[PDB]
């Protein structure tokens, strides 16, 4: 029997923001987001998840506190997440995340009725 690390994480900080998804955006943006996000997270060490539903946002990123803010610096710079109200900024410990996620891929499939496809002609 070996011991676990147990919670370790002196320096992570989670930022939790509530969005707006702009009108602005497209799927292309969306699309070009999740790749580039996850390619710095990955390299920030921040993980994530993202939760998009009836046009709103809820994301948040688990980080170093500074690469946290490097990223948001690099995010709230933006006009595509309609306000990016994160508004939460919490140090915390950490483990939940390896990384960082999201939703919206090369389509969402059936949920399409819910917003995507609202009407044809
Ligand atoms: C809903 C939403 C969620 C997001 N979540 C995350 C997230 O979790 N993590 C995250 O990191 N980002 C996140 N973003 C930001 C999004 O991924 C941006 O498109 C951003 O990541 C672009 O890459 P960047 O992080 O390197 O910063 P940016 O500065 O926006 O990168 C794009 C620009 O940076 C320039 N650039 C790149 N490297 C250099 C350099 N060395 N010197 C000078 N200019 C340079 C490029 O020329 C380009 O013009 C999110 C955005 C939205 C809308």
Redesign the pocket.
């Known amino acids: 029997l070996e011991a676990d690390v147990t919670m370790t994480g002196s320096d992570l900080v989670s930022c939790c923001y509530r969005?707006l998804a702009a009108p602005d955006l497209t799927l292309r943006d969306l699309l070009?987001?999740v790749e580039?996000?996850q390619a710095?997270?990955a390299r920030?060490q921040?993980t994530?998840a993202?939760f998009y539903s009836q046009g709103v946002?809820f994301?948040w990123?688990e980080g170093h506190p500074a690469a946290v803010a490097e990223?948001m610096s690099?995010?709230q710079?933006?006009r595509?997440?309609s306000n990016?109200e994160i508004l939460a900024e919490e140090s915390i410990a950490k483990r939940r995340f390896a990384g960082?996620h999201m939703q919206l891929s090369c389509s969402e499939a059936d949920m399409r009725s819910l917003g995507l496809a609202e009407s044809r002609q």
């Open positions: 969005s070009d987001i580039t996000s710095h997270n920030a921040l994530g993202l946002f994301q990123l990223v690099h995010i710079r933006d595509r997440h990016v960082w």
